[PDB]
Amino acid sequence: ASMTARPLSELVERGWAAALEPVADQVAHMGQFLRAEIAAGRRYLPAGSNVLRAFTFPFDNVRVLIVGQDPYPTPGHAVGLSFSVAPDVRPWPRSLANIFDEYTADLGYPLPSNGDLTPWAQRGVLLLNRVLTVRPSNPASHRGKGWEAVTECAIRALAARAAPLVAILWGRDASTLKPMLAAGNCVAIESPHPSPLSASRGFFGSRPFSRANELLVGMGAEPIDWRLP
Ligand SMILES: O=C(O)c1c[nH]c(=O)[nH]c1=O
């Protein structure tokens, strides 16, 4: 079942499997790393079957990617889509509450009913983290353990498609993908991360949702429907 045991052709959507072929061995290696963590009595989030969830929506349909740092550190929050929580989760994580405050300020929409960002993933938004696992209660605990080559490969593969792309890069780890978006079909929006620690330094007022749609329209691409129920 794990990414140690089974090939990309089974774990992810067909387009993503071909896109991530250069990091096939690296993905299996990450499988081995998580096995070794369980063997040692350390835990990881999200659940193994959710780790590559962002690549289970069609590669060919991605128009925008949102890139965070790493998954939520609290058990019951991370679901393998960056910033998303399961429909029954309340309260929202403070990062997500901050995203929803900018979402209302930018778009004029009411607060969403819940924290499930599945609609965005279904409408061509890739919900990526630079690093795809974390040890509970220890943010950035799996930084530099091999995920960066996988998320680099994903961005590089998206950018090489003969299709417009807009990247929303939230925080310092996300912004290390900026050099791979240099090509003329690609444009990056960068801001500080919506985490309480950083959000007051430029996240609030950044209007990422409306600016991504302006950037798409200007490249001849259809805008994202951001409206959550
Ligand atoms: O608060 C955070 O750092 C994050 C929390 N959850 C994510 O999915 N990505 C992040 O970057």
Structurally, the chain folds into a number of domains equal to: 1
| Cis-peptide into 91, omega within 30 deg | yes
Atom in ligand 1 nearest the alpha carbon of residue 82: 8
Query: 128 - beta bridge partners?
Result: 67
Q: Which of 210, 60, 81, 75 is nearest to 134 (CA)?
A: 75
Backbone angles phi, psi at 101, to 5 degrees: -65, -45
Active-site residues, by number, are 70
Structural resolution in Å: 1.7
Atom in ligand 1 nearest the alpha carbon of residue 173: 11
CA atoms of 162 and 11, how far apart (whole Å): 25
Solving technique = X-ray
CA of 220 to the centre of ligand 1 (A): 31
CA atoms of 125 and 118, how far apart (whole Å): 9
**Residue found under tokens 């949702």:** 209
Which residues approach ligand 1 with their CB closer than 6 A? 68-72, 82-83, 95, 129, 193, 195
Rg of the chain on CA atoms, in Å: 17
CA of 83 to the centre of ligand 1 (A): 5
The DSSP annotation for 56-72 comes to: GS-GGG--EEEEESS--
* Position 225, amino acid: D
Domain that holds residue 70: 1-229
- Provide CB contacts within 8 A for 144, sequence distance 6+: none
Backbone angles phi, psi at 66, to 5 degrees: -110, 125
Q: Report whether 98 contacts 203 (CB < 8 A).
A: yes
Q: Which of 34, 38, 43, 26 is nearest to 2 (CA)?
A: 34
Q: Which of 166, 137, 159, 21 is nearest to 70 (CA)?
A: 137
Query: How many CA atoms lie less than 13 Å away from 90 in the CB half-sphere?
Result: 5
Q: Report whether 82 contacts 134 (CB < 8 A).
A: no
Q: Report whether 160 contacts 128 (CB < 8 A).
A: no
Q: Report whether 112 contacts 228 (CB < 8 A).
A: yes
CA of 139 to the centre of ligand 1 (A): 9
The DSSP annotation for the chain comes to: --TTTS-HHHHS-HHHHHHTGGGHHHHHHHHHHHHHHHHHT---BS-GGGTTGGGGS-GGG--EEEEESS--SSTTT--SSTT---TT--SPPHHHHHHHHHHHHHH-----SSS--HHHHHTTEEEEESS--BBTTBTTTTTTSSHHHHHHHHHHHHHHSSS-EEEEEESTTGGGGGGGG-STTEEEEEE--SSTTTGGGTTTT--HHHHHHHHHHHTTPPPP-----
Atom in ligand 1 nearest the alpha carbon of residue 69: 11
Query: How many CA atoms lie less than 13 Å away from 123 in the CB half-sphere?
Result: 13
